[PDB]
Design a binder for this molecule. Sequence first.
Ligand SMILES: *[C@H](CC(=O)Nc1cc(C(=O)Nc2ccc(F)c(Cl)c2)ccc1OC)CN(C)C
Length: 173
Amino acid sequence: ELRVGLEESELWLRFKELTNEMIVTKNGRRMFPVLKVNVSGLDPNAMYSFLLDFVAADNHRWKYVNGEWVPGGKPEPQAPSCVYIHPDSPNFGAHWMKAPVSFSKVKLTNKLNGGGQIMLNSLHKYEPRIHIVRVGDPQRMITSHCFPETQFIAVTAYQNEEITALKIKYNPF
Ligand SMILES: *[C@H](CC(=O)Nc1cc(C(=O)Nc2ccc(F)c(Cl)c2)ccc1OC)CN(C)C
């Protein structure tokens, strides 16, 4: 049976319990922690592509005041994000199951869109969404999934100082 598990789920939870933040800049910043998944249960001989996009967890604008994240009261419809393709796509199931599938190269921006960069709306909450699509045979969506531990708020600068401490501790950047 299909099984797609989040690697380093405990560190992701460490960030989630404080409300995770990801820096968005004009040219882009890589995510931390890195989105990595362990995959099993695919057809080892079928052809698949791994895609990544970002879905807004809600339509509100968030702000960090008095040490707490709070939403606004004037939500807006959100535009669909650009779709990032894993550089190993397309590939066989045996390749995707051999080792963790890492999305370390994607860069989150507030402007530049495409070629590895994905533009997000600042101060909005997002979930990364992984898509496994079968490319051969009858092409079909195998799965589309968001891991709740990977939820984050896009920021132009870190607001929670505990988040800054965590990023410095576990990411050399
Ligand atoms: C975004 C660049 C971009 O998104 N390029 C791109 C997207 C797709 C795509 O939407 N694939 C897809 C979506 C949903 C789904 F269910 C399936 Cl099966 C496939 C395909 C190909 C692409 O580029 C080649 C920035 N741009 C400026 C909007």
